[PDB]
Design an enzyme around this catalytic site. Sequence first.
Site, PDB file in Angstrom:
ATOM      1  N   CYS A  89       0.813  -1.212   0.000  1.00  0.00           N
ATOM      2  CA  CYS A  89       0.000   0.000   0.000  1.00  0.00           C
ATOM      3  C   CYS A  89       0.852   1.270   0.000  1.00  0.00           C
ATOM      4  O   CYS A  89       1.838   1.372   0.738  1.00  0.00           O
ATOM      5  CB  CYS A  89      -0.914  -0.008   1.226  1.00  0.00           C
ATOM      6  N   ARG A 128     -14.558   1.365  -9.673  1.00  0.00           N
ATOM      7  CA  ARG A 128     -14.049   2.100  -8.524  1.00  0.00           C
ATOM      8  C   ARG A 128     -14.905   3.333  -8.268  1.00  0.00           C
ATOM      9  O   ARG A 128     -15.544   3.870  -9.177  1.00  0.00           O
ATOM     10  CB  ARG A 128     -12.566   2.491  -8.722  1.00  0.00           C
TER      11      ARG A 128
END
Lengths: 360, 369, 359, 361
Positions: free
Chosen positions: B192, B288
């Site tokens: 991440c 998304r």
Amino acid sequence: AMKIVKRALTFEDVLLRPGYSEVLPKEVKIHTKLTKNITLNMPLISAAMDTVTEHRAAIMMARLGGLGVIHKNMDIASQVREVKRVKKSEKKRKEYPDANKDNFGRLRVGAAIGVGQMDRVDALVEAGVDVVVLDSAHGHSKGIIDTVKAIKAKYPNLDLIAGNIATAAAAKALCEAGVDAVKVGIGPGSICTTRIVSGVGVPQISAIDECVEEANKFGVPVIADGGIKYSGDIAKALAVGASSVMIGSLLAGTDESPGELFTYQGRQYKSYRGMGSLGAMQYFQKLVPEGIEGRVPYVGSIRSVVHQLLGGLRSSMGYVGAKDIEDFQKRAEFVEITTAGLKESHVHDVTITHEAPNYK
Amino acid sequence: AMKIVKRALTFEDVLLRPGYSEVLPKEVKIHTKLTKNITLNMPLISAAMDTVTEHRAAIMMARLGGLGVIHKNMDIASQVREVKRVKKSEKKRKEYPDANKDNFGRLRVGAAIGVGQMDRVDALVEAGVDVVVLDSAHGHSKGIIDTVKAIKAKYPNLDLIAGNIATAAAAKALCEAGVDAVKVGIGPGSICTTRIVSGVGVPQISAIDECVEEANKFGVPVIADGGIKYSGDIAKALAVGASSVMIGSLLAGTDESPGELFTYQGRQYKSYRGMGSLGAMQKGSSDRYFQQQDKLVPEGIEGRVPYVGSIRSVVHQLLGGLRSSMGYVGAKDIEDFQKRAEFVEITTAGLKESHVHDVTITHEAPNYK
Amino acid sequence: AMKIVKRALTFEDVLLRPGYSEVLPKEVKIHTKLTKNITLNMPLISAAMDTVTEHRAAIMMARLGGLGVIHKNMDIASQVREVKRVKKSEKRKEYPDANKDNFGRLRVGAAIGVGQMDRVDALVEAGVDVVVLDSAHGHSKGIIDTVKAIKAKYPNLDLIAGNIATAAAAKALCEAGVDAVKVGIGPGSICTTRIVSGVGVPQISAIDECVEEANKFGVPVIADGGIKYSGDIAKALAVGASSVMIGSLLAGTDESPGELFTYQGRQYKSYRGMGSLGAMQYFQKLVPEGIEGRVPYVGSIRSVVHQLLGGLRSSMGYVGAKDIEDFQKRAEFVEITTAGLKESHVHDVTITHEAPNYK
Amino acid sequence: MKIVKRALTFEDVLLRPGYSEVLPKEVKIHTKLTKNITLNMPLISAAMDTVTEHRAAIMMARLGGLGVIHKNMDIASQVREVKRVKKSELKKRKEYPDANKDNFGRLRVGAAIGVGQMDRVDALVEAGVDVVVLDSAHGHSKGIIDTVKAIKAKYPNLDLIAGNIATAAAAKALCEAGVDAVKVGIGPGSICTTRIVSGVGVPQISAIDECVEEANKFGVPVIADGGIKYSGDIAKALAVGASSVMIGSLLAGTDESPGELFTYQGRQYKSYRGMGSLGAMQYFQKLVPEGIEGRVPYVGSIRSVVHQLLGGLRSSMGYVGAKDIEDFQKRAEFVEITTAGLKESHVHDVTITHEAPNYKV
Ligand SMILES: N/C=N\c1c(C(=O)O)ncn1[C@@H]1O[C@H](COP(=O)(O)O)[C@@H](O)[C@H]1O
Ligand SMILES: N/C=N\c1c(C(=O)O)ncn1[C@@H]1O[C@H](COP(=O)(O)O)[C@@H](O)[C@H]1O
Ligand SMILES: N/C=N\c1c(C(=O)O)ncn1[C@@H]1O[C@H](COP(=O)(O)O)[C@@H](O)[C@H]1O
Ligand SMILES: N/C=N\c1c(C(=O)O)ncn1[C@@H]1O[C@H](COP(=O)(O)O)[C@@H](O)[C@H]1O
Ligand SMILES: [Cl-]
Ligand SMILES: [Cl-]
Ligand SMILES: [Cl-]
Ligand SMILES: [Cl-]
Ligand SMILES: [Cl-]
Ligand SMILES: [Cl-]
Ligand SMILES: [Cl-]
Ligand SMILES: [Cl-]
Ligand SMILES: [Cl-]
Ligand SMILES: [Cl-]
Ligand SMILES: [K+]
Ligand SMILES: [K+]
Ligand SMILES: [K+]
Ligand SMILES: [K+]
Ligand SMILES: [K+]
């Protein structure tokens, strides 16, 4: 006993907490103030360095909504030609819809000057420069303040940025002399050795915070200059109260920066050097330099770099729930983290195999 | 001035103190709550990532007593087939005596959804999914909360996990919307880059602690998601109040994870990538919301992890570390572990002292690298 | 909210302040207590590990004034034979600080685990001076019950018990009648307990807390693990430990078990955790708490001990202390930063010669 | 356990900029070496057999500072080195206008001695040494104190530096014995392993601060000795209250230091070793060393190195607004920084391609 007045933090020391959000990153507004009288459509300024900003970089930064500051490591005639090249630059209105223009539709541009350089000021004013950036290693000085007063006395409507500073007392003194913005940053720049050579400086996050609080009393914007490594640093600098961010190293490897590409062992690079480096120097300052000469990887166009940077800023505001920059600053809540928390925040325990556009 | 609200810690900042103990690691009980209404027989969940969990990893995670969450980077038809492959999976009862099963003796499975994907929820429910994991980069948002409410209004008995969050206010908002668990972790994942590209995040130990304190007022379990590097991190996350732990990188190099093995200079690897990396988003099945001119701005990277063998071998070492921790604390079960847990904050030097130091390792330990 | 009870420090976090000194390092006294009833002539113990201490290392440790603890990773017959080899070893002008029992025999310790009363019986019959009840978690019912059963059967047998890291654990072991407590959860060079289980206490704070409790019972503390340099020994003793147990610094010696082997022009010996696979193949497929590795070959134990004790003497001279008890009374620490640690080590110079006491 | 303080060193702190009306080229950098001896710039070359013999001491004095002849030689040899400096001194007047000279126009020189070396003191005094540096690993000791008293009893007007120390109590004891300066530094030296082998020391910035506050009560200057790696460290040491700085590693690779050049893999080096290393040793102290033997790059002339060091100090004083050293110390305000702030201060996110004369990673 020694007077420690502060435990000072920089970007890597803090994170923004997420907040309740009703806004998408694509919908937030990122207009901001460069000076008391000049707005930007996005908060980024390319640095006044001879390996970052001449006319081509300044034009792209303005077209994308920000600003370039033409460096002053050139004769007056040359810097006038550079400013004129930007002003006379302006299919494009559909292509660059956020372009930062003056009242006549011309791209905005800034130019750097030094202490006492009134001849250079006269010629930049005559060339139509939008804003002059009075740059010194030490902006909290008699030479800078006297220069601010002489310029305002001659050109009352010329917007003036002055720096660099890192304390509230410095912000107060420049604001009281009538500057239109202060530039904050003593030592944080990628190529800068001021803190190591002289022992002097303030970690950038605390410097911004301290100077914003003082400058806000005068309605004077703060430009956060140097030490930006990632888009997240832009977000943090703006969240603590800066109105714009000046960037050097992230823009020096672009097509539009001065200097040619070169290959070193299969990979492409561009030179990037401090303006206080030996090679760049060939008022306040054999030479004892305060910067180094180096190289950064080639990263393509300014446009592609700016796109990733502003996208990280938009993601940050969405995380915080902010609809625009001032709301961002009102909502911002920070956490101080540890080294372990920093390790945790970067990529860890995984070997990267594809290059991310916004993370190296 | 700037508002710093706390100094936040993560796993490497803290250690558990030993306590008086009358229980042996082999005797402690490690059952826990996944949601208000779903128990696990061990506290591990495999991450909803397209290099970690499809049906085969989910089957093994449930057989060992935990859970897999099928990722959502695939069309609805495919995710339905993955859920059904897990549901229809069931010598095995003697072999996997801690299998995590529903009321009909079927292995339990979760599946990830995004904001506003009610069609996908409809088809997963029809396929018999046990729990829906509503995942966003930013769970503390109107879109997520509106989706919680619409799912509960349509499926009042569907267990719902929502995330990711990292603050008490976020936990309160999700709990008030009626979630059955909250998932905690903004930025800590191995792959991440959220904290670096956006500047936003809370170190994971403090984020768990703060969210557990709020969610506990609602009786809502906390899933600690991301940043787990060693079995000791699992122990610290549970001890500080999480009910379960979601793991990506440690499971990505297993036989059962998707993707093929590959050799790079005499060593075997498997690919592991963020679901917000370019490569993950380039696939056309990635709808998304918060993350979505042209070119995408990613929040993760694409990489590789070493091959580690079976999920079973990995889980065995992970749970062994957790049992050893509970033994050191004197804890007979997870709830007792959380009641007894006392932490110390350590320095960098204390961290260096905790790892192997001043010795060159020559044999590879199964639980340390 | 989470209960953080302290911010814990270890060796690298602190330095001793210099004090006014009228003593030279060569004249300070370094005798100390191993247990309530056993003295040492120098404060070092070699670890109960199968790559550190069998009879030859224990003999040399006792000859130099310290102690070796025979490890328990062998059957009872072999550990008996190892203890007897030390006891029957005996030079007096060559080793004038030798640590001897009432009959002039070298002292030796031996490790045991929970419940191993048969092993205790045989070690007692072999004349062992002290039994070291060793567990990954000394603060346990199994350890405490073993303490009471040994004291019930052998009231005069000196007993060390560990490992612990808290004042509560020190109190429980002392209340059961131990003659010393051994402090150290996780710090060992080869140890992964803190990573695998998340459990441990940074060693300087662990010693300080346990010494404050054990002192109430007159019970010495053994500081076990994490020693990297002679200065770490000085800090551990100054903060209140009576003795120091060392593994990795002695594993590379002639006397430790194991053959020297050469790897790319350099010489090494194996050094592994006793909770590693290799070593393992009560409290604990196996989930290990240690690794298997190698350390450089450093020559004889005597040469290593000489450098370690020279650092200790130097420390006591800096502090002005005539002996260990005085050292602990005078000791004042400063907490330092990472920068301060960097400054403390060798910096900004490329080393070209190998120093005997620094690497 | 008794933790007296959280102690900081150079990299932990930065000086804040202040309002300035002076330019670096205009500030004054004269300072006190001792109660009675002035320096025209605040740098002293270390008493180490790889740093200072007559040639380095001559250059240090010509540039306005001082060299201390090391004591790793018999008394005859050290006398020879001292009078070589004293006899070193028209075109030199224009060449070295800041030369640090005694009442007779001769370059100043220091010489090191140990505990109980009164014979050595006698011969250095007779050779006209300006200042004697009583050097011990542990200056806060009966042996050092008794030596101070015996030297003052025999030579009441001989300036005497004594060290090394790191606490206010040590500074008080030396000042009460009548020293003319204290030298501060237990463990910070580049080559020094005292803190690692013994566990003893005080981070250098806090040690200077503590000792200055005590020594100032006696009007006694503090010499900050060891741990200097950059010109900014000199600035920080002086700003926190030291009167002068002693430097080893930064001067060991110069033309003027003892020992010749040697090439190792296409680069030139000089040896640099602790005086408590085995090689240098072969009162307070097989031997157990407190230093290592190593090498430093060759950096050219002392003059070039000093020029960069002093330019960093001048830049620092201009940033603070200080017209001279005393004013620098009155104005100085520090911030404590984190390791992230330290990373930010150094060069970062750029690969250096040309070597700066005053910066190395
Ligand atoms: N005096 C310290 N630094 C220098 C130097 C030098 O000393 O040689 N020349 C430029 N700067 C600063 O650096 C910024 C860029 O920083 P960056 O975005 O690359 O991090 C610029 O905008 C300047 O404010
Ligand atoms: N946005 C930050 N992280 C991402 C990314 C990305 O960045 O693209 N894709 C997944 N995640 C998170 O990471 C966890 C695994 O973390 P791990 O067990 O490997 O430490 C997963 O469970 C996710 O919660
Ligand atoms: N459980 C953690 N560590 C182990 C292990 C292992 O993990 O397998 N086997 C021994 N120990 C401890 O380590 C010390 C040596 O420490 P050292 O002097 O080398 O730093 C020994 O004295 C033991 O107390
Ligand atoms: N005892 C610790 N250090 C020693 C050693 C040694 O132990 O071997 N010999 C010299 N020193 C000190 O080091 C300074 C130079 O420091 P530097 O400028 O290179 O950082 C010298 O001026 C001494 O004060
Ligand atoms: Cl405008
Ligand atoms: Cl064009
Ligand atoms: Cl000009
Ligand atoms: Cl492009
Ligand atoms: Cl969908
Ligand atoms: Cl005895
Ligand atoms: Cl740190
Ligand atoms: Cl004078
Ligand atoms: Cl002599
Ligand atoms: Cl020259
Ligand atoms: K991360
Ligand atoms: K360890
Ligand atoms: K052997
Ligand atoms: K040192
Ligand atoms: K910098």
